[PDB]
Amino acid sequence: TRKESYAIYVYKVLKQVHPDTGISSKAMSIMNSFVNDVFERIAGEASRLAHYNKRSTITSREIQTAVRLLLPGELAKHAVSEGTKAVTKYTSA
Amino acid sequence: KTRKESYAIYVYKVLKQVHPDTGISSKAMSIMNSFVNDVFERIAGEASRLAHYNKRSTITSREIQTAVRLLLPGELAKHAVSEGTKAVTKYTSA
Amino acid sequence: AKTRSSRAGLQFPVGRVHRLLRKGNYAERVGAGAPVYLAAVLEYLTAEILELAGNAARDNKKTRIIPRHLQLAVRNDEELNKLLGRVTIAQGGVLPNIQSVLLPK
Amino acid sequence: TRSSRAGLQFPVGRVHRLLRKGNYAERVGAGAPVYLAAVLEYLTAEILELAGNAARDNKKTRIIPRHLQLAVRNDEELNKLLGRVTIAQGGVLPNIQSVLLPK
Amino acid sequence: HRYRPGTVALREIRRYQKSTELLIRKLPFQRLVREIAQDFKTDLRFQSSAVMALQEASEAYLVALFEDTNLCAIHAKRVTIMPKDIQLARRIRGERA
Amino acid sequence: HRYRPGTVALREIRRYQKSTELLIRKLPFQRLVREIAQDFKTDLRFQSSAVMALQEASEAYLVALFEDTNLCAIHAKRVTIMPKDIQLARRIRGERA
Amino acid sequence: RKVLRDNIQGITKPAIRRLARRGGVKRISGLIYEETRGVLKVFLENVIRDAVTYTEHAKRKTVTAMDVVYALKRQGRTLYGFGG
Amino acid sequence: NIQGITKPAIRRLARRGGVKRISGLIYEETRGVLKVFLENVIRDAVTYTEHAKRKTVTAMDVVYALKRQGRTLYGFGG
Amino acid sequence: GGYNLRPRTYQPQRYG
DNA sequence: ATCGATGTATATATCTGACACGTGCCTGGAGACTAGGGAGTAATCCCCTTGGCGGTTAAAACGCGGGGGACAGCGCGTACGTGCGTTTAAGCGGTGCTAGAGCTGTCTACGACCAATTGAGCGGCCTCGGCACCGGGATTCTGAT
DNA sequence: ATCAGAATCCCGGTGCCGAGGCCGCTCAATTGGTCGTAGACAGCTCTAGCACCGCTTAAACGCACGTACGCGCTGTCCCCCGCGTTTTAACCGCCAAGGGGATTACTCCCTAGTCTCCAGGCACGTGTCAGATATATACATCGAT
Ligand SMILES: [Mn+2]
Ligand SMILES: [Mn+2]
Ligand SMILES: [Mn+2]
Ligand SMILES: [Mn+2]
8 A cells, every 4th residue: 555754855855964874764764753743743833823813824924933933943043044945946936 | 892702601501500609700701711712622633633543534423522531531531421422312313 | 492502402502612613624524413522521521610619619608709719629629630730720829738847846 | 846946855745735634724825835845854954964973973874763862862952842752762862970970 | 026937937838828819029020021022022012911921820830830849859858949959840840951 | 700889780871871772571561561451442452563662652751750760869869769759750740649 | 212121130039939938838048039030031931932923923013912822832831811 | 460570671771761779669669650651551542443443553543642641752653 | 955954063951 | 009800892704684776557746727715905993002100108128136957977777789590481483364454346424515594692881799908806826934 | 834926817897890680783503405525334355463382592580698878866057037127119090192903995816626647756676785793802991909
């Protein structure tokens, strides 16, 4: 049965930060579980954000303000930097 | 002005059933209204994940019942399940 | 019977709970028995607290339930305390408790 | 693909679907999946950067769960983000209390 | 007339455990909130109930912390709470590393 | 020869804090899991990954508990952990009433 | 406007003392008062940082009671009596 | 059956926890604490299994139970 | 790559 | 500080299974396109937040004197660590059996969606009695003689 | 063992406003009908979990010794408590003004929805190098002298 994961995506990220390194199946599931947990934690905060403000849409602004609530200060500062960069680049292309 | 909803009338009905000669202050009623919304979100939130875990798109009385067993302590869950099952069968007959 | 709360023998509004579930982004569809069950559980827990708070209000020789009475009820019942272990009741105070080693002879 | 248009390695398309079928809101606006995919890609890059360093310090080329635990528990902020999280087969940091050492 | 050291403290413990009023003065606490919030973003206003909700939550946190702190002092065969009792309490309940 | 008491004890701490393997035998732990599960529902089966998931969480819970337990003993000017230290850690954690 | 300065000292020594009395504390060390001010400042920073973040997301200049209640619930310190 | 958690097994867990000297009554206190932990997690895991109408407790039921107990676990799915 | 990684990894100071 | 030795750490010789890659099938993502509503935006009223003043006084602050708790010192008893020899069971390799998990097809029971209907539920106004507040007095008890 | 200053408990009277009630306006829930798909069901399949076995051995076990750690007692020191007096500003009430929270009305663009096309992503299948294993040495290190 076709099961999905983030395995092929953390490899492409691993090869950009450390091209001459690998990762075991045990550590791969840990990375896979890490992405899903942070995905749910961010999307859950963004859901409450839209509900608190009587709005029906989760846009990039709800994702940003959810990152500032969940990630620690120095991690959140660079995450917004990565988020805002990809959005403006996605709009230009 | 703005029409703001609340559980004030329904908490006041239950209070008179239990203590007919007892009232509640504005602050205490706000605390009760905060209690209901919290438990509402907890139960509905757990029932929401129960449907997602089983690839379902419907929150029925079975999901809410399972959410009660997970959240409420021992005796509270046993009685709350008795109240819900009694109500849902009474609702089906009418 | 007209309202869905009367068909279920409940005091809490089944119609309002049904709307909140649908407009709360919990699932794509909501069963007909979910708001009945949930409003019944919310009525039982509300009754359980108002029973103990009313007694506390009577023990303090008062007619109206204040936040203090809600605190004495929750914190003295083990089951309610576990349910609200990470909850703060405004103007509730604390339970009278003094450690034994602090007491004189 | 929307991942290349955003310059991301993580699937912008898969994130957009998971936001829809996750019952987070009635509608999911564009850019929100590319923003979230970029944030998830950044955080994975931050952990793999510090875990890969832990592997090189432990004289290994493949990252094991131990290298992930060393990378998170030694970073002040990854430890705070993953405070209530247990990493399997990660062990603990070497920490002996000073009053337990001999004189 | 003079009371022995300890009888007035135990009297105050009984006094403030029977009551529910806030123990921090309103105006000093409100200025502290505005000062801390001003460092996050300037030109901020507060609803009167928003500050009260902060004081209701802060005082309830400190009282609960003073309980776990008192247990740490009694655990070390002491009656006085010391800064190391507060830090141990904050470490065990997960607020510190 | 013979090592003084506490010499190899610190050696074991450095040995087990350096490794990541499980420290409880898997079969006695698996029988304990099936015994407790039998009291909630009968005729239950367990996946291999399901039992290993419980063991990874149970050991990581206890190891973190001994870290808090050890700090309570040091707080009382002791180096031996005692039941009163575990009870204080779980009380401050909020697990024990 | 007036410049706010050194308001952590507003939490006087007797105010910290009353909070400890309600906590069932008999004797108090002299260094507790500065430690409590540091703990409270750290507590207020985390709650206000999230509260004003909700205020910023709502495009408002006023911190509402709901902003504080939503923030306390995030921290795991749910509060009753002010909304929600 | 609870005695399967032997004394040297508890000592190894404490050694990883940085404990140098262990009392005698710790082992019976540890078995009771471990039992209360497994009781709370397996109760929720079986609840997830009963809701799925299954007779085999899967690893996801364990991961879901640990999550709501505040003991989130990585590496076993989810 | 294009990741704006923070250059400093501070160690969390623990009790004792 | 010196010396014998004891467990630990490094080296490199060789073996194996998990990793990383390759192949092709396929299903979810993307491009093209229509429809409507959520919300962006400009307009507007009034709620309530901020600011200031003084009269009042409970509370904060500082200093005094000493009682009792912090804690360092210390002796005694014993509980726990180290370790050698005895007993137990778990881990591994290998095989057999089927419960049950899972996946594919089929039909209806159920719930989203929509339009006309109407009273449950809310805000606004009103009134008194629960209880907050003031001041008198009876009781308890802790500390002095 | 007695007696007085303190605080707390308490008792009647008084005055203020918040709760509980009434009334009528409005919006959300009820009613009834159709459409469509999720979910319940049944049949087939095969994966995974369970069961039984005996060999080698690492692990649990138990006993024995003697240490040094836990803990009870003492005594010295000074810190923190209780209190009177002086100082400070919180609290209350009352007023001013404007900014921004909340309601409101109109146009659109952004996204859900549907359809056709195709490659990104996954199962599988297989070879190879990372690393698990280990023996002998190297060396960091503890206890006896
Ligand atoms: Mn400032
Ligand atoms: Mn020397
Ligand atoms: Mn609108
Ligand atoms: Mn204006």
